[PDB]
Amino acid sequence: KDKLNPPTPSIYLENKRDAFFPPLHQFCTNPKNPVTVIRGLAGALKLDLGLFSTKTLVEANNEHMVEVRTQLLQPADENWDPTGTKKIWRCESNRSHTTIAKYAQYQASSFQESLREENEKRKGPFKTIKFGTNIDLSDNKKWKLQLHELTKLPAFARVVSAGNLLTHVGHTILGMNTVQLYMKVPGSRTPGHQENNNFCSVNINIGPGDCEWFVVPEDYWGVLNDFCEKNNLNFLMSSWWPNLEDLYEANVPVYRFIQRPGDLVWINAGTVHWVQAVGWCNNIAWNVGPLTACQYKLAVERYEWNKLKSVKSPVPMVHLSWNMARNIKVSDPKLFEMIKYCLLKILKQYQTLREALVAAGKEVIWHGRTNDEPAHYCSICEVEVFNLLFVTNESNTQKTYIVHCHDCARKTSKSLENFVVLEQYKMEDLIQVYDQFTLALSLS
Ligand SMILES: [Mn+2]
Ligand SMILES: [Zn+2]
């Protein structure tokens, strides 16, 4: 079917008016558009992409850390087993570290080398390449000019904004509400995935070369999960590169497009995607969480799925839900009902546990909290832990306060005799936040 190769939702910008036009924001967050390519974004805003060129990055912080992926240079849109015999989903990829200066040297000499090959005239086996990924641009003292340039974007796409759920978390989530950079050579691949907790993502290509993107809508993610399981792969944790002929056979639609320098790619919530560099280029990217029923729902879903799969959630959705109720006026009826429902479940579960502890003669110790204090996760199983923290007698004494969930504490100490129970929020105060959380009127 032609329906299996649909056109890319595209927007063509010419000037700042186009960029700040409110129907642009609405188009991107619309659940019917799995991806939006905003062409000419940098040119329309007069963004200086030069601030992210390799030459500029070397000057700024030449010893900055780069995560290296070593990969094979695969042909076109395919992925072959190392012997060149058959197309498979699993990708070979090995990890190491380097610096911006050292990777810059490789990026440049890579280009010079292919110029010489091009002037020499005249199934594998495949060449080996290196991809510089996940470069941390969180420090405002190291990247002042770079980060300031990105405040020129329209609000809905900024790293920080009043309408961004990740801004309301209240603390840093590295690489989600901070910027990451990528330095590439041709063939540099990002394997198949969904964003952390299904949050939207924003990506700008710095150039000078192009990237090629492959995209599948959220509601087909289960099909790809089966494919992984039938090929002995972990959908969430393994490196895989889909066989397009398999997807076509299974009637999965695939959006495919080219991202040129200055183009911005908006990946909508839960959209499955994978990417490869066509030329030599750098990219920047971060996450955003629009205030919509769709975004909140898909985020909660992935939060619960990660528990079943024993994978940590980078976004603490309990902590976030309470902050929304504390600080945000919500006027969408559907979104409001979702948050209210979740808070009620949290409150009931907490009341049940607390009464069980008291009925068994276990002391609950008032511990309170400092504000802007991040959410806590279990030091053993990495689940989010809210309000009641389980800490060993020894860790308490030393005031290291090393957090455990209730289940992990019980597994260690059958009657909790080795633990104390710390409480960060009074029940009356949580009940009030819940009771005063009501639907705001908006005529929009
Ligand atoms: Mn991504
Ligand atoms: Zn645990």
Side-chain angles (χ1 to χ4, degrees), residues 4-31 33-54 56-58 60-85 87-91 93-116 118-119 121 123-140 142-229 231-333 335-336 338-347 349-371 373-398 400-413 415-427 430-444:
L4 292 181
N5 305 120
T8 318
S10 307
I11 308 290
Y12 307 88
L13 302 188
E14 304 285 359
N15 56 26
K16 275 191 185 172
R17 167 233 171 259
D18 299 341
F20 294 98
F21 195 45
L24 177 65
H25 168 210
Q26 287 310 307
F27 186 99
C28 289
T29 60
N30 184 342
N33 302 319
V35 58
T36 295
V37 187
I38 308 181
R39 304 214 185 253
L41 183 275
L45 292 176
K46 293 186 187 201
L47 282 195
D48 186 8
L49 297 179
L51 291 168
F52 303 94
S53 69
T54 291
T56 304
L57 298 171
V58 173
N61 296 280
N62 70 289
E63 288 198 328
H64 212 72
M65 170 172 60
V66 178
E67 300 187 9
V68 179
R69 303 293 191 272
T70 301
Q71 309 170 329
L72 296 173
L73 178 55
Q74 299 281 331
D77 49 19
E78 310 167 346
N79 182 69
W80 296 82
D81 83 278
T83 79
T85 317
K87 290 183 277 190
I88 61 173
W89 281 52
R90 179 189 297 279
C91 328
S93 165
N94 293 117
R95 311 192 161 160
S96 55
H97 294 168
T98 193
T99 58
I100 284 180
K102 276 295 200 337
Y103 188 87
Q105 184 188 0
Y106 168 77
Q107 193 181 42
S109 75
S110 171
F111 178 63
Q112 292 297 306
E113 172 180 334
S114 87
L115 284 183
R116 294 178 182 274
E118 176 181 90
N119 205 48
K121 305 302 162 177
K123 301 188 57 58
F126 301 109
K127 180 190 174 176
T128 280
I129 57 160
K130 290 173 281 171
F131 171 20
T133 199
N134 304 323
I135 305 169
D136 177 11
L137 264 58
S138 63
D139 192 334
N140 187 63
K142 292 185 177 172
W143 306 104
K144 191 175 189 280
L145 291 187
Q146 283 73 23
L147 297 188
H148 174 256
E149 191 72 8
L150 305 180
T151 68
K152 296 182 188 183
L153 297 166
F156 78 93
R158 292 178 194 165
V159 187
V160 187
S161 86
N164 182 3
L165 288 176
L166 295 175
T167 301
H168 288 279
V169 169
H171 57 268
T172 299
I173 302 176
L174 208 56
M176 298 199 72
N177 55 23
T178 63
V179 177
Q180 297 209 105
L181 195 136
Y182 309 80
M183 310 172 70
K184 312 188 183 172
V185 300
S188 297
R189 280 180 168 185
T190 302
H193 67 289
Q194 285 164 303
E195 295 303 298
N196 293 339
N197 287 106
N198 280 340
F199 277 82
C200 297
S201 77
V202 173
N203 186 301
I204 300 166
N205 181 0
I206 307 299
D210 297 338
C211 288
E212 186 177 23
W213 289 68
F214 301 83
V215 154
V216 166
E218 186 275 329
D219 47 309
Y220 291 87
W221 84 274
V223 178
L224 275 69
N225 183 66
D226 292 330
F227 267 118
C228 287
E229 279 180 359
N231 285 274
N232 202 61
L233 289 162
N234 188 310
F235 177 91
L236 294 170
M237 301 294 268
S238 303
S239 291
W240 43 272
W241 183 271
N243 186 342
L244 292 180
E245 288 177 342
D246 285 345
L247 295 183
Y248 185 89
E249 187 192 354
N251 289 289
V252 171
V254 176
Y255 296 72
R256 173 184 190 154
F257 61 90
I258 303 295
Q259 180 199 28
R260 297 183 174 79
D263 292 347
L264 184 158
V265 167
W266 177 280
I267 292 293
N268 223 353
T271 293
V272 194
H273 57 289
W274 53 105
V275 192
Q276 66 182 349
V278 174
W280 292 260
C281 66
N282 299 344
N283 292 75
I284 51 180
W286 55 94
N287 293 99
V288 171
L291 277 160
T292 66
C294 178
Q295 175 66 101
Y296 183 77
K297 180 185 166 295
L298 288 172
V300 167
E301 282 175 12
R302 181 47 47 92
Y303 182 82
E304 288 301 323
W305 183 253
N306 286 342
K307 291 179 184 173
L308 302 186
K309 297 306 208 174
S310 298
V311 174
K312 183 186 171 170
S313 282
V315 189
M317 293 300 295
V318 166
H319 176 98
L320 175 56
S321 291
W322 282 108
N323 274 357
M324 292 163 71
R326 281 183 189 274
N327 308 327
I328 299 177
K329 307 214 139 311
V330 177
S331 74
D332 173 38
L335 172 61
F336 174 82
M338 288 173 181
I339 304 159
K340 193 84 177 169
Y341 170 84
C342 285
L343 289 175
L344 188 55
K345 282 202 91 172
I346 295 160
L347 202 48
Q349 200 273 345
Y350 153 66
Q351 286 168 338
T352 296
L353 176 57
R354 204 192 190 278
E355 292 178 56
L357 293 169
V358 170
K362 194 66 184 171
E363 184 191 11
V364 181
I365 291 155
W366 172 241
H367 184 63
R369 185 179 158 262
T370 90
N371 310 329
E373 176 171 318
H376 301 293
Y377 297 79
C378 181
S379 71
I380 299 180
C381 80
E382 301 194 292
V383 73
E384 180 180 10
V385 182
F386 174 71
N387 196 8
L388 300 174
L389 322 178
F390 298 82
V391 174
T392 66
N393 294 320
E394 294 76 26
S395 173
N396 184 69
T397 293
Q398 298 168 30
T400 52
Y401 302 123
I402 299 178
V403 178
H404 300 240
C405 70
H406 177 237
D407 290 334
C408 282
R410 290 284 190 178
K411 270 153 195 162
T412 304
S413 189
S415 301
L416 295 178
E417 61 267 38
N418 296 98
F419 289 83
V420 308
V421 181
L422 306 178
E423 180 169 66
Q424 293 210 287
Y425 301 92
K426 288 300 197 187
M427 187 182 298
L430 292 182
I431 299 288
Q432 175 131 357
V433 168
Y434 177 80
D435 286 336
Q436 294 189 359
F437 182 59
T438 57
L439 181 62
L441 177 61
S442 170
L443 278 54
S444 290

